[PDB]
Design a protein around this ligand. Structure first.
Ligand SMILES: [Mn+2]
Ligand SMILES: [Mn+2]
Lengths: 612, 161
DNA sequence: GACAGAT
């Protein structure tokens, strides 16, 4: 008398890791009838009975949502029909992977399910997508029982996985309903607006032929960020301001450049009087001296957003290229899961052993050996979103083993990892305040007492400056020259990819796995152009769209509707609001905006005539 | 015939012409220096006050302003901030106060620091200069030790910004 | 013929 228990993970890597951990090492692995997901079998104990365990893995979302027939046709239905009278069905993503039939055939004779999927919102939706395919295949329950299970986990360590297996719960249907409502709203709104815009601007302007003009809850605000930066750049008037600076010539060999306490003035005559009552002086007196000690704080654990920003800024890769390189490294086993929002190391994470692997590399051999011999530092405590542990290296790599572009990403990840474990940067901040007549000046220096994480990340260092001369109150130093400088305020530059990710993260536009895509889509639709310094410059098509939306209905570009709709959808997850009611109301609200958009489309057409 | 109103003014500032003082008296009963001061506070100075500040005060050839004098603020601008981000904290606040009496204008600069005068101080607010004030390059150097914000309430075109 | 977002 034996029973079979089926566990399903969200990815083959997690499936294999969890099988290896839970089996103590007994597993037999054989590929299934898909060529991409394997089955690991072993024998153990469940619910006080001996059971045979089968671990398998889905590959992301099993199903997506698409319209039925005669409605996917572009020229057969009015886009306004894609709100209420357009049936939607869940079809298979990656139909090459059979997925549904694979789960159905591996769930025959199963008596329990332990869903080991990701512990995020989309994880529960994938759990129910697995359940509606495996549940009608398993054996019938008897006397109640708890056949469906859910394991809550974030770390993939032995202790964490054992605790997760000991503490098993139930899946949440409300989160799945919330995700389904989000998918439905997004599909309907995007399809309707994109179809209308593409069909309108292609039959009127010959330049936009075979050009896709897409609207979405994320693409439009992402483009609006760049267009708003462009508006700041264009509507900028340089202003002239004067800065008064003086030089003091102690010990006949140096010349300290003093800074003016009142940083700037915007009045020529005021600057003139300030210079007038200062220039005809030859003795500068000392009024203050500071020797305050300060610390530069070590980085938090690496997440996908920070990795993308540093890749765009320093390394020089687009978000999509960085994500692809990180995915290849993760597949080959060099780094962990590359799509994380977590900046907090798990308590049971093995920092010391992972840092031990990177001891033979010539670049950072000395630092790692010093860290292990003289004790390591506790990493900072950050956000602990329960989806995935932060991006950390787990294999020693060399420039020969890796490529010319994966090595640069790997080098930063491993350099970041040592910095988090390393100490802080302690530096002195000397300041001397001078009285030249009625007016004051300061001279600020900086010297490094003990570099910490700086020696692993030399770019995040303290620049070397010569130590300011020793001097106390009452010391008088001859002053060489004081001169007024004329300066003008500089206009801001176009949004960089690093800056856009911060604004996308702040306003909740896109996810950890969708931020690279949304930036790439608006580049492919010729909305923005990538320029020097990874700057995103809006095109003529990008300006007319965002400007036209402001004229017609601002509620389509502001980066607050996405958070507002999500907050309404969050009520489904908490059980306060019904699923049908929120979906019906939100679609109805957007339906009348579409009709306003269609009947007031002359706003965009006015701005399109000038360019195309 | 006892113009104790003018007598008290000649000792406590408030240079006001005959027309101004007769127009700031709310009753033909007797001298009420307190309520004349109150009405002057509630009234614009440009139409009632006499002329006190020396001519060519906005240029050189003058070094000191002597005596206690009440003057009306007409405009206030933060010189150490751009016209766009007027509340920027990238530089210490410095205020360029356009100040006047009934006839002649002058400009003052916040030298040390004045918490009493702010960027939102309403135009028409009145300030008393006490002691000897230093005029450098035509600018009155104003600090907290020679500036008394008497306060006032006169019509606000600033509300329309 | 295409679409949305997200994994
Ligand atoms: Mn996931
Ligand atoms: Mn996520």
């Amino acid at each position: 008398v034996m029973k079979t228990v089926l566990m399903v993970a969200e990815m083959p890597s997690l499936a294999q890791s969890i099988a290896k951990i839970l089996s103590r090492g007994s597993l037999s692995s054989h590929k299934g009838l898909n060529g991409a997901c394997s089955v690991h079998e072993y024998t153990g104990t469940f619910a006080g009975q001996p059971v045979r365990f089968k671990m398998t893995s889905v590959c992301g979302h099993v199903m997506t949502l698409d319209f039925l027939g005669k409605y996917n046709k572009w020229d057969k239905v009015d886009p306004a029909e894609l709100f209420s009278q357009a049936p939607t069905e869940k079809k298979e993503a990656n139909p090459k992977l059979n997925m549904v039939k694979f789960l159905q055939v591996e769930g025959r004779g199963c008596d329990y399910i332990v869903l080991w999927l990701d512990c995020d919102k989309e994880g529960e939706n994938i759990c129910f997508e697995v359940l509606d395919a495996v549940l009608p295949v398993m054996n019938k329950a008897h006397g109640g029982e708890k056949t469906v299970f859910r394991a809550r986990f974030s770390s993939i360590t032995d202790t964490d996985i054992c605790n997760a297996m000991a503490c098993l719960g139930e899946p949440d249907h409300n989160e799945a309903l919330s995700v389904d409502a989000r998918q439905e709203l997004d599909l309907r709104i995007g399809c309707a607006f994109t179809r209308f815009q593409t069909k309108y601007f292609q039959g009127k302007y010959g330049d936009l032929d075979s050009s896709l003009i897409s609207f979405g809850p994320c693409q439009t605000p992402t483009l609006g960020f760049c267009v708003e930066r462009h508006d700041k750049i264009q509507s900028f008037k340089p202003e002239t301001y004067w800065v008064l600076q003086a030089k003091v010539n102690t010990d006949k060999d140096r010349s300290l450049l003093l800074d003016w306490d009142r940083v700037r003035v915007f009045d020529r005559e005021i600057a003139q009087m300030f210079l007038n009552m200062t220039k005809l002086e030859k003795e500068a007196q000392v009024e203050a001296t500071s020797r305050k000690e300060k610390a530069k704080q070590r980085p938090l654990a690496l997440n996908t957003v920070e990795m993308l920003r540093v890749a765009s800024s320093s390394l020089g890769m687009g978000p999509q290229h960085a994500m692809q390189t990180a995915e290849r490294l993760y597949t080959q086993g060099y780094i962990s899961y590359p799509r994380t929002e977590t900046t907090h190391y798990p308590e049971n994470f093995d920092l010391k052993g992972s840092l031990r692997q990177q001891a033979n590399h010539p670049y950072w051999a000395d630092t790692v050996k010093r860290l292990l011999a003289e004790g390591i530092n506790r990493p900072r405590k950050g956000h602990d979103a329960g989806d995935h542990p932060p991006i950390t290296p787990m294999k020693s790599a060399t420039e020969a083993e890796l490529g010319g572009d994966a090595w640069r990403l790997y080098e930063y990840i491993t350099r970041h990892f040592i910095a988090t474990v390393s100490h802080d940067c302690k530096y002195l901040q000397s300041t001397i305040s001078f009285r030249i007549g009625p007016e004051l000046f300061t001279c600020s220096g900086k010297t490094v007492l003990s570099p910490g994480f700086t020696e692993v990340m030399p770019w995040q260092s303290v620049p070397l400056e010569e130590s300011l001369p020793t001097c106390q109150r009452g010391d008088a130093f001859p002053v060489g020259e004081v001169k007024m400088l004329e300066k003008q305020t500089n206009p801001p530059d176009y949004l960089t990819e690093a800056e856009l990710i911060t604004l996308m993260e702040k306003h909740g536009i896109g996810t950890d796995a969708s931020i690279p895509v949304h930036i790439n889509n608006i580049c492919q639709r010729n909305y923005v152009t990538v320029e020097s310094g990874r700057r995103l410059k809006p095109t003529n098509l990008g300006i007319v769209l965002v400007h036209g939306y402001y004229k017609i209905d601002a509620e389509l570009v502001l980066p607050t509707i996405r958070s507002a709709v999500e907050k309404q959808l969050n009520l489904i997850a908490q059980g306060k609001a019904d699923y049908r009611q929120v979906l019906g109301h939100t679609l109805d609200v957007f339906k009348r905006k579409f009709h306003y958009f269609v009947d007031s489309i002359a706003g965009m057409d006015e701005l399109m005539e000038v360019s195309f | 015939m006892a113009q104790v109103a003018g007598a008290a003014l000649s000792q406590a500032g408030w240079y006001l012409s005959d027309e101004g003082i007769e127009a700031c008296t709310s009753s033909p009963d007797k001298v009420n220096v307190n309520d004349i001061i109150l009405i002057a506070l509630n009234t614009d100075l440009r139409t009632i006050g006499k002329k006190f500040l020396p001519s060519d005060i906005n240029s050189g050839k003058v070094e000191k302003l002597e005596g206690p004098c009440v003057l009306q603020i007409q405009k206030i601008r933060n010189v150490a901030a751009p016209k766009d981000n007027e509340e920027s904290q990238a530089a210490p606040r410095m205020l360029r106060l356009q100040m006047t009496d009934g006839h002649i204008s002058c400009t003052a600069v916040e030298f040390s620091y004045m918490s009493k005068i702010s960027l939102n101080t309403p135009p028409g607010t009145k300030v008393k200069l006490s002691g000897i004030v230093d005029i450098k390059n035509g600018f009155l150097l104003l600090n907290d030790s020679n500036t008394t914000v008497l306060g006032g309430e006169v019509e606000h075109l600033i509300e329309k910004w």
